[PDB]
Design a protein around this ligand. Structure first.
Ligand SMILES: Nc1ncnc2c1ncn2[C@@H]1O[C@H](COP(=O)(O)OP(=O)(O)NP(=O)(O)O)[C@@H](O)[C@H]1O
Ligand SMILES: [Mg+2]
Length: 281
């Protein structure tokens, strides 16, 4: 199985902490794919995380989670084949300017369907933030970046690992207590603020400072010119006690969602705005 023979790299579309991501195509069947290529010698440090990402990805089967088309090994390089999402991340789409509440609600609804799927599979994402929410060019919204996702089982009904991105981390995760899927609900509340304001609470502070602030301080609220149901949606998520947070399933029925969420195809307006912006940068 030679991925240099099976796939054609068309353009580089991303560079993360390790490896490189390419826009590619299956030379058989001509489906366009995202290809994450990692040098396993250069990232021997991360092989455990890479293994987990691939494992979780292979076990997911949902229109709200980035599809996985397998991994290929060429010499020391691992080729991870995924669904290609060329619309940009929700964070990318914030670059040109603010979202309206119709866009915020539509994006949050789709993130919620993704979380409801994961949580029904007893999986916890643990790194929900707008950068890890990816859109297709025609506005479909999917969860990405499963490198630190956790699996609950019948025996392991809670997780304890300190993991995530600090601005978005739930207080119970930070204070490595036993936690479950409600940790993602906190992160969603922070992401809702991020979608509304362009950045999470404490964004200007040092990450290590935030790590003691999040357990100590009052939970964040959304202030300013936002509808009260949006402010209430945020408040519902950002409860320091995880058992008082609603499930993703309940949140799908929240008034801010029901009132403001529209068809995902309307998000092409946002995707075009990003393309216009990018062309004049
Ligand atoms: N399936 C995909 N389709 C399109 N773009 C993607 C896809 N997966 C990842 N990307 C983008 O490619 C880049 C590299 O992604 P990745 O290697 O997963 O690092 P990252 O987690 O986004 N950043 P980091 O947390 O600093 O390592 C990012 O800008 C992603 O948004
Ligand atoms: Mg990441």
């Amino acid at each position: 199985a030679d991925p240099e023979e099976l796939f054609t790299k068309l353009e580089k579309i991303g560079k993360g902490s390790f490896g490189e991501v390419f826009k590619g195509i299956d030379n058989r069947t001509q489906k366009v794919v995202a290809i994450k290529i990692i040098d396993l010698e250069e990232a021997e440090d991360e092989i455990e995380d890479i293994q987990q990402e691939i494992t979780v990805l292979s076990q997911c089967d949902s229109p709200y989670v980035t599809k996985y088309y397998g991994s290929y090994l060429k010499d020391t390089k691992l080729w991870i084949i995924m669904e290609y999402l060329g619309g940009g991340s929700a964070l990318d789409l914030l670059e040109p300017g603010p979202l309206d509440e119709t866009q915020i609600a539509t994006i949050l609804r789709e993130i919620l369907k993704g979380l409801d799927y994961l949580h029904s599979e007893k999986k916890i994402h643990r790194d929900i933030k707008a950068a890890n929410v990816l859109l297709s060019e025609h506005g479909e919204v999917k969860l990405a970046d499963f490198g630190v996702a956790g699996q609950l089982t019948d025996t392991q009904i809670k997780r304890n690992t300190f993991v995530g991105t600090p601005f978005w981390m739930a207080p119970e995760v930070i204070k490595q207590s036993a936690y479950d899927s409600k940790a993602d609900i906190w992160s969603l509340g922070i992401t809702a603020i991020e979608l509304a304001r362009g950045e999470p609470p404490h964004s200007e502070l040092h990450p290590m400072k935030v790590l003691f602030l999040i357990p100590k301080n009052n939970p964040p609220t959304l202030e300013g010119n936002y509808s009260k149901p949006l402010k209430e949606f945020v408040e519902a998520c950002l409860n320091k006690e995880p058992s008082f947070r609603p499930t993703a399933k309940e949140l799908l029925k929240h008034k801010f969602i029901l009132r403001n969420a529209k068809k995902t195809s309307y998000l092409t307006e946002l995707i075009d705005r990003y393309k216009r912006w990018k062309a004049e940068q």
